[PDB]
Point group: T
Chain length 62, copies 12
């Protein structure tokens, strides 16, 4: 059985790096992280632009 958590990563560099940011966090807390599916992307436009990528991160249970 796989479980997915819905995480939004952030980066001041790119959408790819923002996806990586979410995956990094998943891997810090979860075992057996296997894949991620991009579900949304955006940009927070402030003093700087922060790229965001929302991902379902799938991990194998047990």
């Amino acid at each position: 059985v796989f479980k997915k958590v819905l995480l939004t990563g952030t980066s001041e560099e790119s959408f790819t790096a923002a996806a990586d940011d979410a995956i990094d966090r998943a891997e810090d807390t979860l075992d057996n992280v296997v894949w991620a599916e991009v579900v949304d992307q955006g940009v927070a436009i402030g003093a700087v632009r922060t790229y965001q990528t929302e991902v379902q991160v799938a991990f194998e249970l047990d």
Copy 2:
């Protein structure tokens, strides 16, 4: 990084109050709740009508 949980709130009053019910629960257990996105709405039609609003509730990790 943000994480979202998928909660369905309920109210005998309104769709807004049902969204609030879910957010109330999120805030009881989670720190740094920042926003909610409505993803579904409905009504359980019994002795009384119960309005339901399903929300992704986003919170900041750490």
Copy 3:
């Protein structure tokens, strides 16, 4: 077996009241109405504003 009818309720007060308007009509004509799922919402903007909520209203057959 459940059957759904696609009804648009109207209210000069709120989206919740507009959903109720549709459900009210369903319950006037149908037996065993059990739930409603919101599928669209809008506002007719005239002399007054009329809130509309479109619902699939599910009822149990037999």
Copy 4:
């Protein structure tokens, strides 16, 4: 011909009031506003909760 603008209204009271907030703004600047279609709803969760409703607001050209 109709044209639509994509507006997000806000209210500390309800999703209906947030839709109204967007429509109010449309009517301040545009002639012949005829209808609005809800396209998203959410809640900014801060010191207070701010309900938001995003609407396509349609107006007749000329």
Copy 5:
């Protein structure tokens, strides 16, 4: 309040059995599991075919 977890069950037999696999896991760890909504289905095609069914599994909080 209901909460949903997003689980992908697997079976070498059928899409129904794969949905059951996810629900089985939910019921092992969670109290008050009430329903599941199918959100995706697929097949891993290897030495054998493994049917997968992704479900939102809803449970009542408290």
Copy 6:
């Protein structure tokens, strides 16, 4: 001209059998039933699991 009715069939066995349950009901009351399109699937999780499959069932008018 074809008309569709939106029916949710149920089965304690499978998603296919649940689709059949809806079609069975359609054929009991309607003439010239020609096809069904699956639009949703789920499982009611109680004393037993009840698989549900929602179908648009198309029939030829006249």
Copy 7:
């Protein structure tokens, strides 16, 4: 309150004529038909091509 029926019209001429075919049928049986929304279009490719347009046809109840 409005109600919608889901009809597929057919024409050997055009998608517009196929929409009209569905509306024609609605108006033959129903009072207060007010609008139709196109939800699908296709073509049956046989001895001749038959254009099909599926519409939700809305009518005012009472």
Copy 8:
């Protein structure tokens, strides 16, 4: 950079002519109109039927 405006054209003749009606209006007011994407179609059913086609009309900025 391209910008899109969301216009609903109308015609008593056809969905194609309704798309053209929107594009005609775009070209009256905007420079460098390049393409249109159909996003919705419907029919206002009154004394006469009025076909409507909603289009995103894209134009090149500058």
Copy 9:
């Protein structure tokens, strides 16, 4: 077994004629073409307008 190819037909006349253009091409190269489903429509706006209709064209294998 059916297979679908994703084709975009073009016409300077209408969306229906553009669908036909795609189907014409399918029938030139493929045996047992049975149906087409419209998946997108648009207009290339140049010296002339070119209507486009994208279709999944289904054909029976073998």
Copy 10:
């Protein structure tokens, strides 16, 4: 690089068997078939019922 073909399998038994029918055909003609994603399901309702499952079948190129 992966490529997907869009196939509709058929079975007089089940949606799972219909998915298998499509995959069987893919594997007869293609090398390195790796997965399938269900994209639609339905039932042809004639002398017998024929379950259909449409799948994107992914295979590795080279």
Copy 11:
């Protein structure tokens, strides 16, 4: 109240840079640009490849 404009940015480098191109244009003409949501991505494949990213760019009114 927020308003969104639908812009397609372009870059010969990346999807992120294409999103930035749209945002750059928004900020040249509009005050109080706050966020952007990615709604489509593609690539024009000519003498060179031009990455495109379509964004809803939100700005605060007044």
Copy 12:
């Protein structure tokens, strides 16, 4: 007439590079490749992360 093939490109660097990988393959085998539309993005999370971008790649027939 345009035809689209559904390809998933891969890269250990970025989503843009993964889109390019698919387009590269298309251009190796097909004439008159004109555009690509991104339809999905994800990441295979193993010894290394492999970014994937699924694209419809459109080419002109003849």
